[PDB]
């Protein structure tokens, strides 16, 4: 049997305070509670007793009304506090069985507590069957807002549904990406971790592996947790804990028992906010640890009341003797609670203020007790207006009217704060964030950092680490994005990706794929768009073909040097004796060849491709139409009159008409080139030999240059047959010998042009090279010995 801490009165208010530690394994079926708890236990008890001292002395709050109370232990465990809840409603059960035939106490009008989530969820299920409203002080789990399911439950603290938001904002602000997370079993940590991993994916924060563990785990079943957390090193450096205090202390104990001191940071919820006892003895393994806290100020009343409490004076608290035993480790000689296991009997000069740690959440307890008090006060003001004390409207007290009073309470807190709540029994509050770090050498301390309210996360980054180079960011794959390296995930976790560079044909179209560009379009420097590369237009000429351009200039100078003594100075009797149109057509074809040389190094526009097609088809046609007239003028004397005897005269009876006959062969190639102009217009075309290499050409076919060459090739053999025996005919200073030598020189490069143009990759300077080579020797072997010998 447990021990109730009762105070008599007219109106009884129950309580559930965690006096002792929760039972370890192989003791939970016995339900034997462990040692006492100094700061969640008897401190809360003396707080409640002094609060009822203050309320029973207030003439404002409930005059002519005495508020009794009962306090039963909870021991953080579902079954223990469920036993004590049965101990509450035992009177309400027997009040319906002794009543009909066949007085103990007054029934409890409303409880306060307990101080976990899951135990409170267990206790309400008994309480809502007897209309007994519950006001909590630390039940913060977000599955307590369901007033459809939980009608008679209230708390003066906000839900942890925004603690997950604040922890998400903290790990958002410090570049965290790939975290670990443990949560204690029972639906505080379950609901908190559920909200956290629901709000992590909205912020894209990957989680390594969620872990659940009881707060009663032995070390053989506890060291597996650090063995599983070790397998994310140095990948996951942070552990987002929702665990309660003994679980975090178990983690620190296992970190010391595995040599992992100072290994990695861990973030916690309010389970170890100001609790020095979860760090004492293990404090080197918790250094740098950041956690949050539901914000609460200090209570000055309890400071001066609580230090003045002596074990020889306190006659209403059953656990104060064992408190005095345990926190000082001594026995007492005459006191009734001996605990003679402790030696070294205490001095009578001891006090409480030595190493006094004021509780963090105990202002909320006083807020809850005041909430019950103002609720009963509002019941009095709403049902019994004209009487001081309990009249016959509250005999007995209905719990539903008490709920309607309690849901609509407005008053001022112990810090003067307006205490009120929604239609869910959740009073809003603010937070504070601390860090556990080395203040002095062998002097470790919690220290405030910053607050949080509705997303307004205000902190101090230089306060933490005293350094802007912090602990290793829990990021799986490093940010290898350089505008060139894509990101490929393996499919398991969206933050453990692989890095891969993209090709020079490829650009970063997206963070997960690289698109290739178009034909010839080239990716830019950050690989986002497909820029272009300009053509090699070559108007001013490449400098080694500039030598060929100056060579064609020298060909024009040789043309001038011939025409200065051939066209104007006509003292030569041989030119006027024969037809002047012979040498005129020779000079015309040669000058048009050297003119079409310079009409090739240009941007290939429409009319410029027309000019180059003229220079490619008609200029070799007219360059040979230059020669062929005077070449086959000798044919009408050779095959016609005396040398080759034939019985026909294929000529006319006039040398001018013989020149008309020689004029016939000119337009035959011109008609075919005009037909090629009709069958193909001279237009611009682009070339892309490589991806980088960009050119602009004309629409040139393979047969487009063979077609002026296919007719001119047979004409070579025609003029060879027409001037075969003439090489031994000494006509006009051996002119036919130099003509045969000229044709012999000429035909070789026309043989050579085809593989040197088809095999090359440019064939355009080869073209003008071939034109000037065809035009040079025909004048060099004919005009210089004809003119210079008659000088």
């Amino acid at each position, epitope marked *: *049997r447990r*021990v109730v801490a009762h105070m008599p009165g007219d109106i009884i208010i129950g309580a559930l305070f965690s006096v002792h530690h929760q039972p370890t394994v192989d003791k939970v079926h016995e339900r034997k509670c462990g040692a006492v708890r100094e700061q969640y236990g008897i401190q809360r008890v003396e707080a409640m007793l002094h609060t009822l001292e203050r309320i029973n002395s207030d003439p404002t709050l409930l005059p002519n009304i005495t508020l009794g109370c009962e306090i039963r232990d909870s021991c953080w465990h579902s079954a223990v506090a469920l036993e004590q809840s049965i101990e509450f409603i035992r009177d309400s059960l027997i009040s319906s069985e002794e009543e009909e035939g066949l007085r103990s106490k007054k029934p409890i009008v409303g409880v306060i507590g307990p101080g976990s989530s899951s135990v409170a969820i267990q206790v309400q299920n008994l309480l809502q069957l007897f209309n007994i409203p519950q006001i909590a002080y630390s039940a913060t789990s977000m599955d307590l807002s369901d007033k459809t399911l939980f009608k008679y439950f209230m708390r003066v603290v906000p839900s942890d549904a925004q603690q997950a938001r604040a922890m998400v904002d903290i790990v958002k602000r410090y570049n965290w990406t790939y975290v670990s997370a443990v949560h204690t079993e029972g639906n505080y940590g379950e609901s908190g971790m559920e909200a956290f991993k629901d709000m992590s994916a909205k912020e894209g924060i990957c989680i390594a592996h969620s872990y659940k563990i009881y707060s009663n785990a032995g070390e053989q079943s506890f060291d597996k947790l650090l063995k599983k957390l070790t397998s994310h090193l140095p990948k996951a450096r942070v552990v987002a804990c929702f665990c309660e205090g003994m679980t975090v202390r178990g983690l620190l104990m296992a970190m010391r028992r595995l040599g992992l001191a100072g290994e990695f940071l861990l973030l916690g919820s309010d389970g170890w906010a100001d609790r020095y006892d979860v760090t004492d003895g293990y404090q080197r393994e918790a250094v740098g640890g950041i956690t949050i806290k539901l914000q609460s100020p200090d209570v000055k009343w309890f400071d001066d009341y609580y230090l003045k409490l002596r074990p*020889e004076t*306190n*006659h*209403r608290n*059953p656990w104060f003797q064992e408190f005095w035993q345990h926190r000082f480790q001594c*026995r*007492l*000689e*005459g*006191f*009734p*609670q*001996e*605990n*003679s296991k402790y030696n070294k009997t205490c001095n009578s000069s001891l006090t409480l203020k030595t190493h006094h740690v004021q509780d963090s959440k105990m202002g909320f307890v006083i807020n809850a007790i005041y909430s019950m008090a103002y609720g009963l006060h509002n019941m009095q003001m709403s049902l019994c207006p004209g009487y001081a004390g309990l009249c016959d409207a509250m005999k007995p007290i209905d719990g539903r009217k008490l709920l309607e009073s309690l849901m609509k309470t407005n008053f001022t807190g112990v810090s003067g704060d307006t205490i009120l709540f929604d239609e869910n029994g959740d009073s809003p509050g603010r937070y504070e964030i601390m860090n556990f770090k080395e203040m002095g050498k062998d002097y470790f301390d919690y220290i405030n950092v910053g607050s949080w309210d509705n997303g307004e996360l205000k902190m101090d980054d230089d306060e933490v680490w005293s350094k802007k180079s912090n602990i290793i960011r829990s990021v799986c794959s490093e940010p290898c994005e350089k505008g060139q390296i894509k990101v490929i995930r393996k499919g398991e976790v969206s933050c453990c990706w692989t890095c891969t560079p993209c090709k020079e044909n490829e650009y970063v179209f997206d963070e997960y794929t690289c698109k290739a560009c178009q034909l010839g379009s080239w990716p830019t420097d950050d690989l986002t768009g497909c820029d272009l590369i300009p053509v090699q237009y070559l108007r001013w000429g490449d400098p080694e073909p500039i030598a060929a351009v100056v060579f064609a200039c020298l060909g024009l100078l040789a043309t001038l040097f011939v025409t200065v003594v051939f066209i104007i100075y006509r003292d030569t009797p041989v030119v006027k004796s024969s037809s002047r149109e012979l040498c005129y057509i020779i000079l015309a074809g040669i000058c048009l060849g050297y003119l079409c040389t310079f009409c090739l190094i240009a941007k290939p526009k429409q009319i410029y491709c027309y000019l180059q097609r003229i220079g490619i088809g008609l200029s070799p046609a007219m360059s040979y139409s230059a020669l062929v007239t005077k070449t086959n003028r000798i044919a009408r004397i050779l095959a016609g009159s005396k040398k080759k005897i034939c019985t026909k005269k294929p000529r006319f009876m006039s040398a001018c008409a013989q020149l008309v006959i020689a004029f016939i062969l000119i337009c035959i190639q011109l008609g075919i080139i005009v037909a090629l102009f009709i069958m193909e217009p001279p237009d611009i075309m682009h070339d892309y030999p490589s991806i980088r290499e960009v050119y602009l050409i004309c629409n040139t076919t393979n047969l487009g240059v063979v077609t002026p060459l296919g007719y001119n090739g047979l004409l070579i053999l025609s003029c060879t047959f027409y001037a075969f025996k003439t090489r031994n005919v000494p006509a006009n200073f051996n002119e036919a010998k130099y003509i045969a030598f000229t044709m012999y020189t000429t035909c070789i490069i026309w043989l050579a042009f085809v593989p040197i143009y088809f095999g090359s990759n440019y064939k355009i300077i080869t073209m003008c090279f071939s034109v000037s080579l065809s035009a040079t020797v025909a004048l060099g072997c004919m005009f210089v010995p004809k003119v210079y010998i008659i000088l």
Partner: nanobody
Amino acid sequence: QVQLVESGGGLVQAGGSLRLSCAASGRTFTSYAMGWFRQAPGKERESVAAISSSGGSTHYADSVKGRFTISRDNSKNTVYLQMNSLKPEDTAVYYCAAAMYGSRWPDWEYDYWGQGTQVTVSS
């Protein structure tokens, strides 16, 4: 509430032995220290013997130190007093009492009492 029942009284020669029994009702007996009293007829009531709640720390008046032996049982929720070296001035009305919120013995703030018993010691 916890009620106390004394038993074991009668006539005995001095120097003998006797064993008083303090039966206890209730179910929270493990959270109480126990105390003893006696009062001779026409005299005052004196604090005689005491035990702690967890046992171990027992207490005896120096008038009866070493002669009386206290004992307790937490299985049956009953304490005892095996008495030795009986003397005719031990003729008194013995009382058994319980307390929780005490100070140094013999200041324990006893909140319960028993019926009592009568022992007369002859010569």
